[PDB]
Amino acid sequence: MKEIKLMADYHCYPLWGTTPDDFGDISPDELPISLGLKNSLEAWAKRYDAILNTDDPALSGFKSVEEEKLFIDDGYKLAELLQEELGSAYKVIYHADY
Amino acid sequence: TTKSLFKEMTIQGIKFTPENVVGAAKDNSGKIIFLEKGNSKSGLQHIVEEHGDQFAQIGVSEARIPDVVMKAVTDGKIVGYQGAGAGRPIYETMIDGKKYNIAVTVGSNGYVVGANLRG
């Protein structure tokens, strides 16, 4: 059994281990999933990286409330696809708060 | 002193409220690094809401997160990068006599954006 947390963080892969032995981000390429899902997960992480204001990070954010909603909406759908592709050998938990 | 660092942050053009600052120090190359209370998008609250459970599991209380993250990024040694190998730097650091790796993203102005433990 392995827990995988789906969660975007700046300049990280959007997948995380949840025990002290495997803390840290996880490349989608390390998981037994489809190329399409790997690409979708990396596209979602790229959208989060884009909200970072690197020169003044306190100003980071989405362009609108609706853009944030769409980002969170899409993460739910990716988490559900990830759980389906990984089956019962993995437990997916989605971090929904941004 | 923190008062001297605040004067230096001020002259370099950083706009900040002292009560929002929870850590500030220089790294070994003289860059001022500082951590603010923040919100879900950046800073301490972003670290805690995203990765606070990591610290809980290794016995580091929430109140200690600022000091631990600050020590990593100002005194730690870069040993790798997250993401595809060019993302968030991973700092080797020491917590209570034990070695840990802590990855930390910092803005160009020294503001600590986010951080996480590694195995």
Side-chain angles (χ1 to χ4, degrees), chain A residues 16-54:
Chain A
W16 303 84
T18 69
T19 75
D21 286 333
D22 74 350
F23 282 155
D25 66 337
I26 299 171
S27 170
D29 284 332
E30 295 293 293
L31 294 180
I33 59 173
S34 67
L35 180 57
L37 184 56
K38 297 176 186 179
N39 287 338
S40 294
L41 290 163
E42 293 154 20
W44 186 75
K46 176 179 185 188
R47 285 160 68 185
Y48 192 73
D49 285 341
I51 77 170
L52 178 63
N53 184 328
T54 289

Side-chain angles (χ1 to χ4, degrees), chain A residues 10 47-48 50-53 57-64 67-68, chain B residues 41:
Chain A
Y10 306 109
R47 285 160 68 185
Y48 192 73
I51 77 170
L52 178 63
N53 184 328
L59 300 187
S60 300
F62 293 94
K63 296 175 179 312
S64 70
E67 180 173 272
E68 176 161 334
Chain B
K41 301 295 190 290

Side-chain angles (χ1 to χ4, degrees), chain A residues 8-10 23 25 55 95, chain B residues 41 46 49-51 108 118:
Chain A
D9 205 359
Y10 306 109
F23 282 155
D25 66 337
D55 293 343
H95 180 96
Chain B
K41 301 295 190 290
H46 176 81
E49 57 97 358
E50 282 218 350
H51 301 282
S108 66
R118 285 198 76 81

Side-chain angles (χ1 to χ4, degrees), chain A residues 4-8 14-16 41 44 74-80 82 92-96 98:
Chain A
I4 300 290
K5 178 158 75 174
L6 178 67
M7 181 176 70
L15 304 170
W16 303 84
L41 290 163
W44 186 75
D74 290 337
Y76 277 113
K77 297 187 283 271
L78 292 171
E80 296 173 351
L82 184 60
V92 174
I93 185 167
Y94 176 50
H95 180 96
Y98 296 93

